[PDB]
Amino acid sequence: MTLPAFKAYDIRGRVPDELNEDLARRIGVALAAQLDQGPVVLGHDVRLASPALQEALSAGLRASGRDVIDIGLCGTEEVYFQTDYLKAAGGVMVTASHNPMDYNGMKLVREQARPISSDTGLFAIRDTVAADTAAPGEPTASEQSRTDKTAYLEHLLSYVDRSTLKPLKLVVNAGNGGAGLIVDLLAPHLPFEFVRVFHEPDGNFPNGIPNPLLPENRDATAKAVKDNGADFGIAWDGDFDRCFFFDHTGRFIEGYYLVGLLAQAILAKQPGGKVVHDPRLTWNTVEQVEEAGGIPVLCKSGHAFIKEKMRSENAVYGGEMSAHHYFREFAYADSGMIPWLLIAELVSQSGRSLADLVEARMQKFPCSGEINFKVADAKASVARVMEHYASLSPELDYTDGISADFGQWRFNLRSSNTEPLLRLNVETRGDAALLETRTQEISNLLRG
Ligand SMILES: O=P(O)(O)OC[C@H]1O[C@H](O)[C@@H](O)[C@@H](O)[C@@H]1O
Numbered sequence: 001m002t003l004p005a006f007k008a009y010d011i012r013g014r015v016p017d018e019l020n021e022d023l024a025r026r027i028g029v030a031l032a033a034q035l036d037q038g039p040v041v042l043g044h045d046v047r048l049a050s051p052a053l054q055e056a057l058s059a060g061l062r063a064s065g066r067d068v069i070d071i072g073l074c075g076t077e078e079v080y081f082q083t084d085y086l087k088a089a090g091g092v093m094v095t096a097s098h099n100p101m102d103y104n105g106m107k108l109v110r111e112q113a114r115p116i117s118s119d120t121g122l123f124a125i126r127d128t129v130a131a132d133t134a135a136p137g138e139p140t141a142s143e144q145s146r147t148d149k150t151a152y153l154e155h156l157l158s159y160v161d162r163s164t165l166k167p168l169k170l171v172v173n174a175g176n177g178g179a180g181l182i183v184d185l186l187a188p189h190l191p192f193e194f195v196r197v198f199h200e201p202d203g204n205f206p207n208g209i210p211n212p213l214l215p216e217n218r219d220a221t222a223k224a225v226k227d228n229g230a231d232f233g234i235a236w237d238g239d240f241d242r243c244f245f246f247d248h249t250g251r252f253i254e255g256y257y258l259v260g261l262l263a264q265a266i267l268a269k270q271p272g273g274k275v276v277h278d279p280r281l282t283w284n285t286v287e288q289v290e291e292a293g294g295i296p297v298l299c300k301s302g303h304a305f306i307k308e309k310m311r312s313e314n315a316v317y318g319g320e321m322s323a324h325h326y327f328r329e330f331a332y333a334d335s336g337m338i339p340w341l342l343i344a345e346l347v348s349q350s351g352r353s354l355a356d357l358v359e360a361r362m363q364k365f366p367c368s369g370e371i372n373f374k375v376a377d378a379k380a381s382v383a384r385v386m387e388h389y390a391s392l393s394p395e396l397d398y399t400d401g402i403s404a405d406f407g408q409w410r411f412n413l414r415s416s417n418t419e420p421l422l423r424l425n426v427e428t429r430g431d432a433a434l435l436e437t438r439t440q441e442i443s444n445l446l447r448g
């Protein structure tokens, strides 16, 4: 067999049987042979095993002659930013994002923070590690500590005109991950009042693993918004590359609608630019990008595909509905921080609440939310759906699973790249009844 921790886009496994310091050191050795020349940036999240796994990575890297830039406890986007900003050969973030307590993992990038994925070097690294029985060498290169966040913070602040910001009251919920540290470093340069929930970094996760999609964790942000009269709330996953928004009523806003909203925010600053979007939910983004004078670019979901397409298109912004937002000047990388700064600026400048910024769009293109299915036979289940709707001759697109456009409604149905599940998304042209009846009909077919 093969090491189960090596996934399509990152390394993730239970410590210590699927991921451990020995494996981490071997990954450092193998990564060194995969990169162009230059040093390697290393950062890590709040999980208890993360520092030890990083040190092991560092040892393997340095045994292979790679200088190491240790940026310390950070978010994933800081590994992306520093890798590009410092013109490093590559970078590794030790993190398990939102996964349970007994899990860890790694996100690996090369020059300009370009992703290393299963077909772009990650499985080559796996196979090297799998067969490596060599005695560990000793370090022949140095590790430097580089925790200065100044350039990163300045880059974040450059997306907004600070003189236009209003003293909004913002709930922030780091979920005991790492986001609160960046919020607190940004706070002296911003007029906002922060209502801090689950703010302190704690890899024991006393308040639950950092996953804002869990309704119990969602409700902590919503309650703090409602109880404090906040303008809106923001939650993050543990490594804060994903951000989740709550309007002033406590309502969680589906990530889909943030894509069109952030695209309009960006296009005000970069007129005529291209905007990359995923195929799961599309109609609202296409319309809002076009209305704002931008050009929408359909792309397969997954950060590797999104970033590749943004690069080839010189795209100014890209967004998925899975709460990842990507910015050209941010090394084409995703940030959980840039989005809420932009939304705070848009609320401040427009005098509109976040709720009203999205309300008409939610009414115009209502969506099911992403619904996941673990079925006995995904392929037969998808076939059963397609056969049922064949007589309506939908317009079919195979960018990412199957997208079917029926005119007044459409769906996307695809296998996940991170779990063994089918993911369904449905949307309609302003028709909530058609949305529910078609969603339920597809669900029944899938469960057949
Ligand atoms: O729906 P999927 O394939 O499980 O991916 C969901 C998300 O996983 C990761 O967070 C990233 O790779 C995202 O780019 C992706 O959208």
Ligand SMILES: [Mg+2]
Binding pocket: 097, 098, 237, 238, 239, 240, 241, 242
């Ligand atoms: Mg994450």
